[PDB]
Amino acid sequence: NTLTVMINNGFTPDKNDYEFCAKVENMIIPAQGHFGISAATGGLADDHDVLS
Amino acid sequence: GKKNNPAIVIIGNNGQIHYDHQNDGASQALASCQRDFRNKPYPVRAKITYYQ
């Protein structure tokens, strides 16, 4: 029930160069759920691309 | 050369550790956090709490 987040900023070719930034402990989630990724592009314009 | 800096590194030395500035003390880094602290509009403020 801790949701630990590690970030690799993409300044290096190293895949595992992960940095902890934030987490929420005692996290309550549905026991079963759907994973999904959503992205929006409003007034400004960013390309949202997921490779893997 | 690891793109980590400007970083903020906690290193506690008992008196027996040489600080490797060439690796910026990455090996003996007890902790590190990634924030920039240069050229800010207002002065940067730091709270350091030793507590238990």
Give the mutation candidate from A12, A16, A23 for the B interface (greatest B CB count, under 10 A).
Answer: A12
Length of chain B in terms of residues written: 52
Contact present, B35 and B6 (Cβ < 8 Å): yes
Structure tokens at B45: 């403020």
- Give me the sign of the Cα torsion angle B36, B37, B43, B45: positive
Contact present, B10 and B28 (Cβ < 8 Å): no
Could you write out the DSSP letters of every residue in B23-49? TTT-TT-SEEE----SS-SS-------
State the method: cryo-EM
Structure tokens at B33: 């956090």
* B8-10 vs A3-7, strand pairing mode: unpaired
Contact present, A4 and A18 (Cβ < 8 Å): no
B3 vs A12: CB contact, 8 Å cut-off? yes
Kindly report the nearest CA distance between residue A3 and chain B, in angstroms. Answer: 19
Q: Does B3 touch chain A (CB under 8 A)?
A: yes
* B8-10 vs B31-33, strand pairing mode: antiparallel
Contact present, B25 and B9 (Cβ < 8 Å): yes
Could you write out the DSSP letters of every residue in B3-18? S--S-EEE----S---
d(CA A42, CA A37): 17
Kindly report the nearest CA distance between residue B13 and chain A, in angstroms. Answer: 24
